[PDB]
PDB file of C-alpha atoms in Angstrom:
ATOM      1  CA  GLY Y  23      -2.470  15.369 -12.612  1.00  0.00           C
ATOM      2  CA  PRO Y  24       0.462  14.166 -10.423  1.00  0.00           C
ATOM      3  CA  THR Y  25      -1.420  11.275  -8.953  1.00  0.00           C
ATOM      4  CA  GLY Y  26      -4.587   9.299  -9.676  1.00  0.00           C
ATOM      5  CA  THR Y  27      -4.105   7.039 -12.679  1.00  0.00           C
ATOM      6  CA  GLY Y  28      -5.608   3.635 -13.431  1.00  0.00           C
ATOM      7  CA  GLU Y  29      -8.872   1.793 -12.533  1.00  0.00           C
ATOM      8  CA  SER Y  30      -9.550  -0.697  -9.732  1.00  0.00           C
ATOM      9  CA  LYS Y  31     -12.269  -2.374  -7.664  1.00  0.00           C
ATOM     10  CA  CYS Y  32     -11.062  -2.353  -4.046  1.00  0.00           C
ATOM     11  CA  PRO Y  33     -11.735   0.832  -2.006  1.00  0.00           C
ATOM     12  CA  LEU Y  34      -7.977   1.353  -1.753  1.00  0.00           C
ATOM     13  CA  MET Y  35      -5.470   0.708  -4.512  1.00  0.00           C
ATOM     14  CA  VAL Y  36      -1.781   0.228  -3.649  1.00  0.00           C
ATOM     15  CA  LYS Y  37       0.805   0.809  -6.377  1.00  0.00           C
ATOM     16  CA  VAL Y  38       4.326  -0.378  -5.718  1.00  0.00           C
ATOM     17  CA  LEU Y  39       6.825   1.222  -8.081  1.00  0.00           C
ATOM     18  CA  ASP Y  40      10.639   1.278  -8.016  1.00  0.00           C
ATOM     19  CA  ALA Y  41      12.467   4.663  -7.895  1.00  0.00           C
ATOM     20  CA  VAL Y  42      15.776   3.064  -8.949  1.00  0.00           C
ATOM     21  CA  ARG Y  43      14.310   1.103 -11.823  1.00  0.00           C
ATOM     22  CA  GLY Y  44      11.425   3.430 -12.603  1.00  0.00           C
ATOM     23  CA  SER Y  45       9.158   0.455 -13.065  1.00  0.00           C
ATOM     24  CA  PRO Y  46       6.438  -1.471 -11.072  1.00  0.00           C
ATOM     25  CA  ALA Y  47       7.633  -4.294  -8.812  1.00  0.00           C
ATOM     26  CA  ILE Y  48       6.312  -7.793  -9.276  1.00  0.00           C
ATOM     27  CA  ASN Y  49       5.250 -10.221  -6.468  1.00  0.00           C
ATOM     28  CA  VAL Y  50       5.470  -7.486  -3.812  1.00  0.00           C
ATOM     29  CA  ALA Y  51       4.379  -9.061  -0.560  1.00  0.00           C
ATOM     30  CA  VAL Y  52       1.953  -6.485   0.941  1.00  0.00           C
ATOM     31  CA  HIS Y  53      -0.145  -6.671   4.078  1.00  0.00           C
ATOM     32  CA  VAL Y  54      -2.950  -4.551   5.517  1.00  0.00           C
ATOM     33  CA  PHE Y  55      -3.903  -4.318   9.160  1.00  0.00           C
ATOM     34  CA  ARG Y  56      -6.549  -2.403  11.130  1.00  0.00           C
ATOM     35  CA  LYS Y  57      -6.306  -0.541  14.452  1.00  0.00           C
ATOM     36  CA  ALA Y  58      -8.006  -2.673  17.126  1.00  0.00           C
ATOM     37  CA  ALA Y  59      -9.568  -1.581  20.420  1.00  0.00           C
ATOM     38  CA  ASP Y  60      -6.361  -2.674  22.191  1.00  0.00           C
ATOM     39  CA  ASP Y  61      -4.228  -0.134  20.391  1.00  0.00           C
ATOM     40  CA  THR Y  62      -3.021  -3.046  18.249  1.00  0.00           C
ATOM     41  CA  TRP Y  63      -3.141  -3.939  14.568  1.00  0.00           C
ATOM     42  CA  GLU Y  64      -5.410  -6.794  13.415  1.00  0.00           C
ATOM     43  CA  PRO Y  65      -5.201  -8.664  10.044  1.00  0.00           C
ATOM     44  CA  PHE Y  66      -7.397  -6.988   7.443  1.00  0.00           C
ATOM     45  CA  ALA Y  67      -6.005  -8.073   4.044  1.00  0.00           C
ATOM     46  CA  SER Y  68      -2.916  -9.053   2.168  1.00  0.00           C
ATOM     47  CA  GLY Y  69      -1.648  -9.701  -1.368  1.00  0.00           C
ATOM     48  CA  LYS Y  70       1.128  -9.192  -3.955  1.00  0.00           C
ATOM     49  CA  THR Y  71       1.600  -6.870  -6.855  1.00  0.00           C
ATOM     50  CA  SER Y  72       1.916  -7.710 -10.582  1.00  0.00           C
ATOM     51  CA  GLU Y  73       3.759  -6.429 -13.657  1.00  0.00           C
ATOM     52  CA  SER Y  74       1.536  -3.392 -13.337  1.00  0.00           C
ATOM     53  CA  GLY Y  75       2.470  -2.812  -9.734  1.00  0.00           C
ATOM     54  CA  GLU Y  76      -1.225  -2.652  -8.839  1.00  0.00           C
ATOM     55  CA  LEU Y  77      -2.703  -4.810  -6.093  1.00  0.00           C
ATOM     56  CA  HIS Y  78      -6.519  -5.157  -5.854  1.00  0.00           C
ATOM     57  CA  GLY Y  79      -9.021  -7.726  -4.617  1.00  0.00           C
ATOM     58  CA  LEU Y  80      -7.874  -7.404  -0.986  1.00  0.00           C
ATOM     59  CA  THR Y  81     -11.261  -6.913   0.608  1.00  0.00           C
ATOM     60  CA  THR Y  82     -14.857  -5.871  -0.144  1.00  0.00           C
ATOM     61  CA  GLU Y  83     -16.881  -2.723   0.533  1.00  0.00           C
ATOM     62  CA  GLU Y  84     -19.027  -4.631   3.051  1.00  0.00           C
ATOM     63  CA  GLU Y  85     -15.888  -5.730   4.964  1.00  0.00           C
ATOM     64  CA  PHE Y  86     -13.961  -2.504   4.562  1.00  0.00           C
ATOM     65  CA  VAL Y  87     -14.941  -0.562   7.678  1.00  0.00           C
ATOM     66  CA  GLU Y  88     -13.794   2.858   8.979  1.00  0.00           C
ATOM     67  CA  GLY Y  89     -10.768   3.473  11.173  1.00  0.00           C
ATOM     68  CA  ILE Y  90      -6.981   3.467  10.926  1.00  0.00           C
ATOM     69  CA  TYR Y  91      -5.073   0.932   8.873  1.00  0.00           C
ATOM     70  CA  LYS Y  92      -1.345  -0.021   8.611  1.00  0.00           C
ATOM     71  CA  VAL Y  93       0.233  -1.283   5.409  1.00  0.00           C
ATOM     72  CA  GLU Y  94       3.465  -3.266   5.175  1.00  0.00           C
ATOM     73  CA  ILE Y  95       5.390  -3.679   1.944  1.00  0.00           C
ATOM     74  CA  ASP Y  96       8.099  -6.362   1.511  1.00  0.00           C
ATOM     75  CA  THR Y  97      10.548  -4.661  -0.901  1.00  0.00           C
ATOM     76  CA  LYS Y  98      13.136  -7.329   0.043  1.00  0.00           C
ATOM     77  CA  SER Y  99      11.223  -9.843  -2.021  1.00  0.00           C
ATOM     78  CA  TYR Y 100      11.668  -7.527  -5.029  1.00  0.00           C
ATOM     79  CA  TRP Y 101      15.280  -6.679  -4.123  1.00  0.00           C
ATOM     80  CA  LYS Y 102      16.210 -10.393  -3.939  1.00  0.00           C
ATOM     81  CA  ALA Y 103      14.879 -10.954  -7.459  1.00  0.00           C
ATOM     82  CA  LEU Y 104      17.770  -8.964  -8.893  1.00  0.00           C
ATOM     83  CA  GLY Y 105      20.076  -9.016  -5.901  1.00  0.00           C
ATOM     84  CA  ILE Y 106      20.044  -5.408  -4.713  1.00  0.00           C
ATOM     85  CA  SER Y 107      21.634  -4.419  -1.422  1.00  0.00           C
ATOM     86  CA  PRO Y 108      18.766  -4.564   1.083  1.00  0.00           C
ATOM     87  CA  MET Y 109      19.384  -1.265   2.792  1.00  0.00           C
ATOM     88  CA  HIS Y 110      16.211  -1.706   4.790  1.00  0.00           C
ATOM     89  CA  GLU Y 111      13.827  -4.471   5.716  1.00  0.00           C
ATOM     90  CA  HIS Y 112      10.298  -3.451   4.808  1.00  0.00           C
ATOM     91  CA  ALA Y 113       8.154  -0.327   4.430  1.00  0.00           C
ATOM     92  CA  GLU Y 114       5.420   0.257   6.999  1.00  0.00           C
ATOM     93  CA  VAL Y 115       2.935   3.151   6.780  1.00  0.00           C
ATOM     94  CA  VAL Y 116      -0.163   4.072   8.787  1.00  0.00           C
ATOM     95  CA  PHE Y 117      -3.248   5.641   7.245  1.00  0.00           C
ATOM     96  CA  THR Y 118      -6.139   7.167   9.229  1.00  0.00           C
ATOM     97  CA  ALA Y 119      -9.644   7.135   7.775  1.00  0.00           C
ATOM     98  CA  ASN Y 120     -12.527   9.439   8.665  1.00  0.00           C
ATOM     99  CA  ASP Y 121     -15.145   8.325   6.166  1.00  0.00           C
ATOM    100  CA  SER Y 122     -15.524   5.968   3.240  1.00  0.00           C
ATOM    101  CA  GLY Y 123     -17.568   6.076   0.010  1.00  0.00           C
ATOM    102  CA  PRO Y 124     -17.220   6.502  -3.767  1.00  0.00           C
ATOM    103  CA  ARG Y 125     -14.501   8.315  -5.589  1.00  0.00           C
ATOM    104  CA  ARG Y 126     -11.826   5.789  -4.553  1.00  0.00           C
ATOM    105  CA  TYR Y 127      -8.178   6.854  -4.814  1.00  0.00           C
ATOM    106  CA  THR Y 128      -4.925   5.102  -5.505  1.00  0.00           C
ATOM    107  CA  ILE Y 129      -1.763   5.341  -3.352  1.00  0.00           C
ATOM    108  CA  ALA Y 130       1.442   5.788  -5.381  1.00  0.00           C
ATOM    109  CA  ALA Y 131       4.556   4.608  -3.523  1.00  0.00           C
ATOM    110  CA  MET Y 132       8.128   4.494  -4.793  1.00  0.00           C
ATOM    111  CA  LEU Y 133      10.972   2.210  -3.617  1.00  0.00           C
ATOM    112  CA  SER Y 134      14.367   3.806  -3.134  1.00  0.00           C
ATOM    113  CA  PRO Y 135      16.784   2.214  -0.651  1.00  0.00           C
ATOM    114  CA  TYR Y 136      19.752   4.454  -1.684  1.00  0.00           C
ATOM    115  CA  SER Y 137      17.900   7.712  -2.299  1.00  0.00           C
ATOM    116  CA  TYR Y 138      15.358   9.284   0.054  1.00  0.00           C
ATOM    117  CA  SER Y 139      12.052   7.428   0.377  1.00  0.00           C
ATOM    118  CA  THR Y 140       9.091   8.456  -1.786  1.00  0.00           C
ATOM    119  CA  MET Y 141       5.378   8.015  -1.146  1.00  0.00           C
ATOM    120  CA  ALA Y 142       2.176   9.813  -2.144  1.00  0.00           C
ATOM    121  CA  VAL Y 143      -1.143   9.694  -0.265  1.00  0.00           C
ATOM    122  CA  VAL Y 144      -4.495  10.981  -1.488  1.00  0.00           C
ATOM    123  CA  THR Y 145      -7.325  12.281   0.680  1.00  0.00           C
ATOM    124  CA  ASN Y 146     -11.113  12.137   0.071  1.00  0.00           C
ATOM    125  CA  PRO Y 147     -13.961  14.469   0.993  1.00  0.00           C
ATOM    126  CA  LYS Y 148     -15.272  13.573   4.416  1.00  0.00           C
ATOM    127  CA  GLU Y 149     -16.864  16.915   5.251  1.00  0.00           C
TER     128      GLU Y 149
END
């Protein structure tokens, strides 16, 4: 298929790949927040990617609750490694959850400052 490749432990796998290099970014500062009761975003998890571009071990299933969550990727850290023109600062995306469970999915995101952005999100059965 187009998406869904690779194993993981966390309930949500984040893959940070480069659209200009066509390879996974290393040491990609990523953060995960959750929608609070004050229409704000609280700290949920955070971590960096590896040579594989995969980032797991953020949180557990007992801590991973339902609700909306916002993810922030620091591409600048990866752009400074080679010295690429930092067209933008960081990439922030919001994901709404309706129900958790098995059959975890992985989010494939591509980094492209020059060309149009590229991101892929997968949905699970909550019916």
